[PDB]
Amino acid sequence: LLINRQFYEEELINSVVISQLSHIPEDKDHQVRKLATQLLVDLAEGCHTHHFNSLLDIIEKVMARSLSPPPELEERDVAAYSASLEDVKTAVLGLLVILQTKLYTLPASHATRVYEMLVSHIQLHYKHSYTLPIASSIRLQ
Amino acid sequence: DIQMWKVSLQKEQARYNQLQEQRDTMVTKLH
Amino acid sequence: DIQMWKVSLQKEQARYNQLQEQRDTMVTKLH
């Protein structure tokens, strides 16, 4: 209900990332993008030096995958496969947002490094010469 | 006089709703 | 049970007036 950051955020971020450590293994795209957005918004105001948990989880998200392994997923998986990949595209969007917020801040390094994550994630993005329109949209933003 | 106990419980719940809403107003004011 | 009902009345009143002050000191902290 409140902005409980002063009174709760310290123990919260820790206990909640500990409980959500099952983010990557469980592969149900919905809660994936959900926790993505949740960490992004909780880092929009995350000045309790806890960009560690959030951005580390985010990096764990981004290296999930970016291109369809099965060469037979003609609208078969790429529908749900892209429902899964849009979790990380939304994560990327939130990185853009939080970096806009942290344009000037003390742990701006975080931004930079996840920014680097971005370009490295973008590097591998153009590495395989992707054939996904959703990946192309990600490139766009 | 069980209905007195009824109205007691009801007015208590109402008092606590007012407590909650005023707490939330103070929350957004602090924000 | 009617006098026992009065007892229940005053018990509820006491408990709710008790938590009332907890809510009001929360208010005062925010003040």
Side-chain angles (χ1 to χ4, degrees), chain A residues 1-72 74-141, chain B residues 14, chain C residues 14:
Chain A
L1 191 151
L2 75 160
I3 41 164
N4 54 336
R5 79 289 194 279
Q6 181 181 2
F7 285 101
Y8 287 70
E9 185 193 9
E10 52 283 11
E11 47 83 17
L12 286 183
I13 295 181
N14 308 318
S15 44
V16 305
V17 63
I18 280 153
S19 64
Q20 290 183 355
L21 289 190
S22 179
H23 36 260
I24 292 295
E26 297 190 5
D27 295 312
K28 296 295 183 182
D29 318 338
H30 53 99
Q31 42 80 27
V32 189
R33 78 195 74 115
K34 292 317 189 171
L35 60 88
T37 54
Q38 283 159 297
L39 288 192
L40 298 160
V41 63
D42 279 326
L43 208 61
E45 52 176 0
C47 283
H48 285 172
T49 51
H50 276 65
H51 323 276
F52 295 156
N53 308 321
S54 42
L55 301 173
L56 283 163
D57 304 328
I58 294 166
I59 293 190
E60 298 144 29
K61 315 302 161 279
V62 308
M63 73 200 162
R65 188 61 186 88
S66 305
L67 181 135
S68 84
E72 319 89 346
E74 44 170 9
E75 324 286 346
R76 306 297 165 263
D77 206 341
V78 60
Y81 192 85
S82 288
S84 180
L85 180 141
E86 57 89 7
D87 306 332
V88 76
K89 86 183 273 290
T90 48
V92 158
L93 313 178
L95 312 172
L96 323 184
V97 189
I98 63 188
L99 192 148
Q100 286 140 46
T101 66
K102 301 312 146 178
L103 190 145
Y104 53 100
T105 199
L106 185 140
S109 50
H110 282 285
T112 73
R113 62 102 160 167
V114 297
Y115 147 74
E116 298 139 37
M117 177 70 259
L118 301 187
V119 300
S120 46
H121 169 273
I122 292 147
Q123 157 78 42
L124 58 93
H125 209 87
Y126 212 80
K127 178 167 64 81
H128 307 275
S129 192
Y130 292 179
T131 300
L132 291 180
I134 175 63
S136 71
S137 58
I138 304 165
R139 300 180 165 185
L140 307 195
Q141 76 252 10

